[PDB]
Write an enzyme that holds these catalytic residues in place. Sequence first.
Site, short mmCIF file in Angstrom:
data_model
loop_
_atom_site.label_atom_id
_atom_site.label_comp_id
_atom_site.label_asym_id
_atom_site.label_seq_id
_atom_site.Cartn_x
_atom_site.Cartn_y
_atom_site.Cartn_z
CB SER A 39 -0.96 0.04 1.20
OG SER A 39 -0.30 0.42 2.39
CG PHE B 101 0.46 1.95 -5.04
CD1 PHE B 101 1.74 2.21 -4.58
CD2 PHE B 101 -0.18 0.79 -4.61
CE1 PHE B 101 2.38 1.35 -3.71
CE2 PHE B 101 0.45 -0.08 -3.73
CZ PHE B 101 1.73 0.20 -3.28
N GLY B 102 -2.59 3.33 -3.44
CA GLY B 102 -3.73 2.64 -2.85
C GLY B 102 -3.33 1.43 -2.04
CB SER B 103 -4.83 -0.97 -0.02
OG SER B 103 -4.64 0.13 0.86
CE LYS C 233 -2.81 0.73 -7.78
NZ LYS C 233 -2.14 1.24 -9.02
CG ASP D 2 6.13 7.19 -10.60
OD1 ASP D 2 5.44 6.69 -9.68
OD2 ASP D 2 7.28 7.66 -10.39
#
Lengths: 273, 9
Positions: free
Chosen positions: A14, A17-19, A35, A135
């Site tokens: 996590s 980018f979120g979990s 995700k 990225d």
Amino acid sequence: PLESQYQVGPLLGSGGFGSVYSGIRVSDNLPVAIKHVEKDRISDWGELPNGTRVPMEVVLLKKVSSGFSGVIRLLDWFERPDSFVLILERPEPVQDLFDFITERGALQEELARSFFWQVLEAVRHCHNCGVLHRDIKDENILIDLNRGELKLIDFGSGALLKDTVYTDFDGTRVYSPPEWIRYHRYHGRSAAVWSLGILLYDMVCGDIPFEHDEEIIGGQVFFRQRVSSECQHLIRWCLALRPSDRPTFEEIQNHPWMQDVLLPQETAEIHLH
Amino acid sequence: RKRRRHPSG
């Protein structure tokens, strides 16, 4: 229904980018990554080719997820009250390139060449599809250890590709180019090429060249490992201070250091198995 | 020499 179609396993990680959870599609036991992104944390929104308003990450993933490629493909997505859920490919066994380089140190140039070539092909695929990743870094590259294939992940800082200037950026600063540091302006392809120079140095030296803004804009590249003169030249060319002095993707792949790349299967047998 | 990840933000 999202909760009936997939079995949820361990948290893979996590962050910004979120979990992300390991998962398995009940329909056929396909390994997936699940995700979760909170709606409140989503900066850039887009519209799916149907008017549905979704995170830009979903727009970009759909643009690149047609056919085979070196990009981790979006298989499905769901909207929940406070979040979006993305179902992504999960190769197995896998290690991201950051951990791989941490464990093995500076990579042999033959292996760095195979990995770097595959990353170039994946980024060319994104740009062909109208998508700028923004990225590119070793943390956002997965290695399929059995197949010798690299996969790009985490399009959450990406954008539609355009030919005009970008004045916003939320990628990784130590991979960002000096024109972003100095002027908060960059163009998509030349900024991507800079980050690829950072990535190649990372592979052949074992860590990225620059940690501080003054190093990024100073444009002095010191080599801390033995690196061939041809590879040094390619790196220093990707890291040219003036963006117009950087190579195109075509010039990178035609560079003499890039010739005679291993196939992915040979890469796995020689270096990963 | 310390090698570290760098968050995207």
